[PDB]
Amino acid sequence: GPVPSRARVYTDVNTHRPREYWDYESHVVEWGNQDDYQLVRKLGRGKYSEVFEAINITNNEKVVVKILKPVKKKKIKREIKILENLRGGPNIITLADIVKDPVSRTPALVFEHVNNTDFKQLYQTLTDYDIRFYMYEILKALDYCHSMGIMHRDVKPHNVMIDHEHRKLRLIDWGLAEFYHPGQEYNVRVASRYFKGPELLVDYQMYDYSLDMWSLGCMLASMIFRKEPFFHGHDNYDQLVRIAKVLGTEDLYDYIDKYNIELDPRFNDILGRHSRKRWERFVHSENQHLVSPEALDFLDKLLRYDHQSRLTAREAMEHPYFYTVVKDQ
Ligand SMILES: Cc1ccc(-c2csc3ncnc(SCCC(=O)O)c23)cc1
Numbered sequence: 334g335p336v337p338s339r340a341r342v343y344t345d346v347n348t349h350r351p352r353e354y355w356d357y358e359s360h361v362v363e364w365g366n367q368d369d370y371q372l373v374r375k376l377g378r379g380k381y382s383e384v385f386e387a388i389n390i391t392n393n394e395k396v397v398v399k400i401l402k403p404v405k406k407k408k409i410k411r412e413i414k415i416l417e418n419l420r421g422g423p424n425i426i427t428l429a430d431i432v433k434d435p436v437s438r439t440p441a442l443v444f445e446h447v448n449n450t451d452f453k454q455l456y457q458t459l460t461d462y463d464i465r466f467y468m469y470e471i472l473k474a475l476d477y478c479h480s481m482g483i484m485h486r487d488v489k490p491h492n493v494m495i496d497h498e499h500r501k502l503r504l505i506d507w508g509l510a511e512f513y514h515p516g517q518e519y520n521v522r523v524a525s526r527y528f529k530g531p532e533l534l535v536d537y538q539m540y541d542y543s544l545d546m547w548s549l550g551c552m553l554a555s556m557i558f559r560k561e562p563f564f565h566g567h568d569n570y571d572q573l574v575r576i577a578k579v580l581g582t583e584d585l586y587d588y589i590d591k592y593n594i595e596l597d598p599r600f601n602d603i604l605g606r607h608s609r610k611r612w613e614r615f616v617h618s619e620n621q622h623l624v625s626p627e628a629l630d631f632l633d634k635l636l637r638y639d640h641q642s643r644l645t646a647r648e649a650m651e652h653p654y655f656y657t658v659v660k661d662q
């Protein structure tokens with residue numbers, strides 16, 4: 334069997350809370366009034382939800398309504414409980430209301446509206462300072478949810494809403510998020526392929542908050558090198574290959590060895606042998622204005638195979654890469 338693992342930080346925050354904090358099945362939802370909201374237009378669709386721009390007709394404010402499709406209620410209750418636990422935290426999307434058809438019982442989450450610019454258009458216009466600023470806003474959200482015992486597990490640009498004119502960032506879609514309990518074996522089928530940490534790709538189930546810091550590193554790399562997504566595999570196996578062509582295969586094998594992970598024999602054929610590339614190799618004239626020694630040092634400390642060796646969100650905020658941001662706060 335593999336070697337056990339426990340989070341370096343916030344290990345027992347849920348152990349100490351009363352049962353009701355993390356026991357989302359027991360939670361009793363307080364429902365608002367469905368007739369306060371009028372749907373205006375469809376914004377998009379998840380695999381288990383559709384998202385609408387809407388208007389709160391009592392105050393004419395814009396809101397976003399996410400109608401959740403007939404799925405197991407346990408999944409819905411977990412997202413609600415997590416959103417309520419984190420409400421008011423820095424850069425965490427605000428759940429303003431929960432409503433349901435009084436006759437058909439179909440449930441809908443009402444969120445504060447963010448005037449988002451789609452990242453595929455926004456990112457290519459961000460300056461070096463913008464990237465540092467928004468990375469720091471995400472770290473605030475992640476340190477907050479991690480300190481409250483919660484892993485996001487789907488950190489990616491699609492789940493980061495940015496009202497750019499107002500320098501306003503919110504981390505959204507807590508539908509994959511989960512409470513951390515030390516020693517628990519979690520589903521590795523989380524996050525999006527390009528942002529999956531190596532622990533997920535090698536089926537190491539005893540992961541923790543540091544999963545989110547890998548995803549963050551992936552985002553950072555795509556922003557400062559202007560290469561989105563940075564690690565572009567065509568399936569989970571190829572995804573670890575793309576990581577290994579950058580981080581190198583030796584550190585990957587050290588990781589697997591350290592945790593006594595039984596690596597699928599298919600992997601050895603396709604992983605090959607790759608040196609670790611210097612982060613400088615990805616710098617060129619089209620991204621150089623976004624790259625600094627600080628940026629590369631910070632990136633290097635997020636994108637580590639060993640989840641235990643990655644910066645925590647709070648350590649990351651201490652990094653010199655953010656020196657000018659912090660004075661601005
Ligand atoms: C698929 C999709 C469609 C629209 C939006 C969206 C655009 S602006 C905006 N402003 C606040 N929220 C959302 S989504 C609801 C929050 C959540 O699911 O956690 C959006 C986000 C995702």
Ligand SMILES: [Cl-]
Binds near residue numbers: 342479645646
């Ligand atoms: Cl953390």
